[PDB]
Design a protein around this ligand. Structure first.
Ligand SMILES: *Cc1c(COP(=O)(O)O)cnc(C)c1O
Ligand SMILES: *Cc1c(COP(=O)(O)O)cnc(C)c1O
Lengths: 404, 405
């Protein structure tokens, strides 16, 4: 693995901000893309473009086949049994909503309950709140620990015969905590409950196998995978997916449509894809998967882990620095500097050409647990370097010196 | 004024050869080709500009956010909405219609009520209302067709009553190219206190669209037919209605506050309806597309496309056993069948000649049912299409007629 050869593929790293070389630590919010993905999408638009859905002419057919090929590649990437177990979505959020409506409405009833965790992204919180509101069920929460880990021993208590679903995050977008999915899924299934996994922060860090996890639902976003915006993947166990009613109605998800005799649906995954999909994004996603797969995920894991160790090692020399989350954390470092407002810190770091994210990070309960209005977050991705970490450290030190 | 060559110079796919022959792409009605400006806009954004939106503290994020909202503004001006806050970013027409069908429909349509659609509707403007009607136990009423491809307008007064909440109608047919008399329908619709949703997916690239003039309550369209990128579209909703609509998808960025005890509250519209990371590249590209189309001018495009249509319809009279569907004043598309031949065979043979047309039911089955055919061939004539290509189509059809009898 060579971070230089990798950095050579990303033009954004050449960008300047406030007159200085960009150091982009915000990858957790969205990932930068290599020229391959961008050029893949662009070239598709330039020499390849037509409509999908098995049009009679050549460009359309080839486009359709490309789309299905990407579906296959995606399926192989997360190691699903069949590509028919994967659905194209706008992203993690839509996927979760789709499950929450399609599967949730038929499988969750009055008096039942769903389980989430206190570290969840809003995407993995609100759709279940909406659901519970619809059918009159209860939303139960797995509580945290001060070190940023969930309390596993509470699960036997949270689960009962009325528990249909466990919605859990693979990796925290704030803390970088990786939850013990295997244990949770094993325990969850014993009570006859399905498990949905939010992997939006997972899939780019290391290999993900959904057969090994035995998770019932799995969702993730492409734009954090160094792919284009507006595309994501929903994996669902075939047995469950085939029995799920459609969510969005429209063209291409129907078998037949009649204004007298009614309407029938085609098979999944296609049952859940209505109207024209996002083709360019799918192509770009394919490219992204190719690129990451070509670098290899264990290499990325190794480099990112060593980089993380370096960063955490260096950040110890920063006075009045408060870190949130465990030592085994993936991809992100959440911190606060003294009593300073997070946005001021962020602004100062921005002035120094360093991009970090501030605010509640779309997890309010997580912030509520730590009794803070917000946190600073630095992401260390595969193209990030020691020099940038040094810039971050020195920056924090300078802020501390200057603002006391 | 308008030069198809100067315009054609901007679209690289038109330089392509297909099955060894120069491409004639008549499938624009399915999806439109993009000029270099759009493609390069999205690409350059990705290359030198890219970050997450939603008011991140650093520079790229802020700039990205403003770019997004600027595109929203440009779109509102493009369709002449009062406010940019009346516009919602969607995956395309289908998601827009579904969003309305769920969000607005569930609260505004009840047992015993009824919705009106037409027989020429795209499935996108059919199925979600079926779903709604099934959910709340309402009735779906249909405006019947005429053999010439026009709706029977005289039937409307009877179809409307005090129980009619919504008219979901298409601006322009994706098959026939029929342009419906929206103003009349909306007047009549409003007289009964009913809302109107307009499917504009086939409209917005042909001529100017003014939603204030139309006074339509909902308007939807797709970006990829407007010569923009895939996976992006616009939902226009009257502010008064939009402000009272509950959220559909839950998640980040559409919330004010989130609590696991005190519950959850929503931010203002339109943002209430945009959950998670939007499609930023698509939005940028969409902005570029709107700029390009506006720069050419819509009336110019309308005139040129009209002359092209007249030419095509004139030339197609010399094709034996050619059956056309729809009126003479049609916009943008020509739906046809050749003798007793299967549409897909015709399409394939035309594909062999380097000509791209579409076949099948075109996602309107009832329309096909009305004409007693399983499918139709459809040729699209867009702003970058030429007389040369029409000549090629005619000669192609004639050759197919020679060969297949
Ligand atoms: C294309 C089209 C639709 C569907 O648009 P999508 O982009 O696929 O969502 C709906 N109605 C009409 C009339 C159309 O032409
Ligand atoms: C980004 C993220 C989401 C939301 O994904 P979107 O692409 O915005 O739809 C959900 N959960 C986690 C953990 C995330 O990091």
């Amino acid at each position: 693995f060579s971070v230089d050869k990798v950095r050579a593929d990303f033009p954004v790293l050449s960008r300047e901000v406030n007159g200085l070389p960009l150091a982009y630590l915000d990858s957790a919010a969205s990932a930068q893309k290599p020229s391959q993905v961008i050029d893949a999408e662009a070239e598709f638009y330039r020499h390849g473009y037509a409509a999908v859905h098995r049009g009679i002419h050549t460009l359309s057919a080839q486009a359709t086949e490309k789309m299905e090929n990407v579906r296959k590649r995606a399926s192989l990437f997360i190691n699903a049994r069949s590509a028919e177990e994967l659905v194209f979505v706008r992203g993690t959020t839509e996927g979760i909503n789709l499950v929450a409506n399609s599967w949730g409405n038929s499988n969750v009833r009055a008096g039942d309950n769903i389980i989430i965790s206190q570290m969840e992204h809003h995407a993995n919180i609100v759709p279940w709140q909406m659901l519970c509101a619809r059918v009159g069920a209860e939303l139960r929460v797995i509580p945290l620990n001060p070190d940023g880990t969930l309390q596993l021993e509470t699960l036997p208590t949270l689960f009962d015969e009325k528990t249909r679903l466990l919605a859990i995050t693979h990796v925290s977008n704030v803390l970088g905590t990786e939850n013990p999915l295997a244990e949770m899924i094993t325990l969850a299934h014993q009570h006859g409950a399905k498990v949905l996994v939010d992997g939006a922060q997972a899939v780019m860090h290391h290999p993900v196998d959904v057969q090994a996890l035995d998770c019932d639902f799995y969702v993730f976003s492409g734009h954090k995978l160094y792919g284009p915006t507006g595309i994501g993947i929903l994996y669902v166990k075939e047995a469950l997916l085939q029995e799920m009613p459609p969510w969005e109605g429209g063209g291409s998800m129907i078998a037949t449509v009649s204004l007298s005799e009614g309407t029938t649906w085609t098979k999944a995954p296609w049952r859940f894809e209505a109207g024209t999909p996002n083709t360019g994004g799918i192509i770009g996603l394919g490219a992204a998967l190719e690129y990451v797969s070509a670098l290899g995920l264990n290499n990325i894991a190794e480099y990112e882990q060593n980089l993380m160790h370096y960063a955490l090692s260096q950040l110890e020399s920063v006075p009045d620095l408060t870190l949130y989350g465990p030592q085994n954390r993936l991809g992100v470092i959440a911190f606060n500097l003294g009593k300073h407002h997070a946005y001021d810190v962020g602004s100062f770091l921005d002035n120094y050409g360093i991009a970090v994210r501030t605010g509640h990070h779309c997890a309010m309960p997580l912030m509520a647990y730590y009794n803070v209005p917000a946190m600073c977050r630095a992401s260390l991705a595969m193209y990030n370097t020691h020099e940038e970490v040094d810039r971050l450290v020195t920056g924090l030190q300078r802020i501390h010196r200057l603002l006391g």
